[PDB]
Design a protein around this ligand. Structure first.
Ligand SMILES: [Cl-]
Lengths: 305, 305
């Protein structure tokens, strides 16, 4: 029993982290087969970041200007190219630790693990979600760019995020591994602000199911609701509208616990309207929305990799 | 910026996890050099656990009864012994992935990362603390025993916990790697209940410092206090008494932020007496106590391994 915010084991990704230095700038790269992926802003100065022209800045860079180091050993760069907001540095040696991997672009509401790194060295691992406003709430300091987010399906690492930017509000923005930013953000130091941080309703419901499975039940009530009635309350509280697709995804948790999805929605409705009254659910005093239904099933069943 | 509940990278420990089977019971073992460590209750049936005599049960076991498997490859057991509540299974092959390591017995209030495993396979990683009542609040299902907790200091893994038992209240108990239980718990299925779950005051204060560093400051006030005055409130709210040793440990965070330790204590006092008023601190609606002062410095500075 027990339910914790749990990251995937990070060893398969640790073996892919390298240091990338261009001039005075050092960040992290991801070494898969004979390619190292990193943020293109490695080529920028702090000045350049206000209004960088990356294609022009890249003209002054050659293969030998990209210093790539794996632990204590230097990698030889034999080519480089820009794809959207990432650079692909072709090296002469395939990473011998390359896991089975995929690149995936995730949807808002999906979760993933981040391996925070500095100077190519892993510092820690934690769990995040792609927020509905396409930011993530991470833990990133200067030098952490190029750290990646991922999921694991048995032996295959699906990389979904690379870290690029911190907004003035302290939230984080980045790209998929094809170099396309999530949301409207760009790799320049400019006035770009995050939209409404909507709560991921289907994830809250999954976590309430997790609570029931693990003994926390005080919030269950005698009520039910409808999708349309619940969504009137969801709107008031800046929650994502619940759809029939969400209901269907919660089917397995509903079957396991015997609590109809719409009954759990009525529990959530009362929690939103009345608060917690100083009580806790799975050790939290607020409604947690960074566990997906699949996360809950996984952790409550013991799936391994 | 940002502050997250962060575990250590788990790769060095992943390479040490094996499966141990005795008769009908399968759990996890830790393979370091030519020894595999696991809970001695692997030799028990579900019946045996009410009142097991481990020395008598072990008489009926030989080396060949302990099936140890590392991934898909079987290890040959050439000896076995019991040390307190763990078994040490000597194998004929040293683990080639053995990291630099130490065994440490931690103090209540200290934190560590857990690599939850099943059938010798890692499932996830998360951060815990040794509670003042010597339980931990983990996420463990049947088959997770033998999963370990650890800290990393650059390249050295300090193993501090091995998982053994779940109490009827859903909290968890286990041993150090010498097989001595934390607290008064025993590896039998009996009436043993946890004591008061005291809040780790020095950790709350460290996390409040983390909040100030990362932009959350609304709880700072115009007040100060003394150790003795603060401890009158700590007692009322089931907080650990704050000592001068704790004050000294917070010195570096006090120097960085310019907020005197006793001023932060006065902020905490007001939070305990008045609640949060529906506000949050670092994304939490309660006072988090599973970050140590060293954790906060580490995450706010970017230490790597
Ligand atoms: Cl909370």
């Amino acid at each position: 029993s027990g339910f914790r915010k749990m990251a995937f084991p990070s060893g398969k990704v640790e073996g892919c982290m390298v240091q990338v230095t261009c001039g005075t700038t050092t960040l992290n790269g991801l070494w898969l087969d004979d390619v190292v992926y990193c943020p293109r802003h490695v080529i920028c100065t702090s000045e350049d970041m206000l209004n960088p022209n990356y294609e022009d800045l890249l003209i002054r860079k050659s293969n030998h200007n990209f210093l790539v180091q794996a632990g204590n050993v230097q990698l030889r760069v034999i080519g480089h190219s820009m794809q959207n907001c990432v650079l692909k540095l072709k090296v002469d040696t395939a990473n011998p630790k390359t896991p089975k991997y995929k690149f995936v672009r995730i949807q808002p509401g999906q979760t993933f693990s981040v391996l925070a790194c500095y100077n190519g060295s892993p510092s820690g691992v934690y769990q995040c979600a792609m927020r509905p406003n396409f930011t993530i709430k991470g833990s990133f300091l200067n030098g952490s760019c190029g750290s990646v987010g991922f999921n694991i399906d048995y032996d295959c690492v699906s990389f979904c995020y690379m870290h690029h930017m911190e907004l003035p509000t302290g939230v984080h923005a980045g790209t998929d591994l094809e170099g396309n930013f999530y949301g409207p953000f760009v790799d320049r130091q400019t006035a770009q602000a995050a939209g409404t941080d909507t709560t991921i309703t289907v994830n809250v419901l999954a976590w309430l199911y997790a609570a029931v499975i693990n003994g926390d039940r005080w919030f269950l009530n005698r009520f039910t609701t409808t999708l349309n009635d619940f969504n009137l309350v969801a709107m008031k509280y800046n929650y994502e509208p619940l759809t029939q697709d969400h209901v269907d995804i919660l089917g397995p948790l509903s079957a396991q616990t015997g609590i109809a999805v719409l009954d759990m929605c009525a529990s959530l409705k009362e929690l939103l309207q009345n608060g917690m009254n100083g009580r806790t659910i799975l050790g939290s005093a607020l409604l947690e929305d960074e566990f997906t239904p699949f996360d809950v099933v996984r952790q409550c069943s013991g799936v391994t990799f």
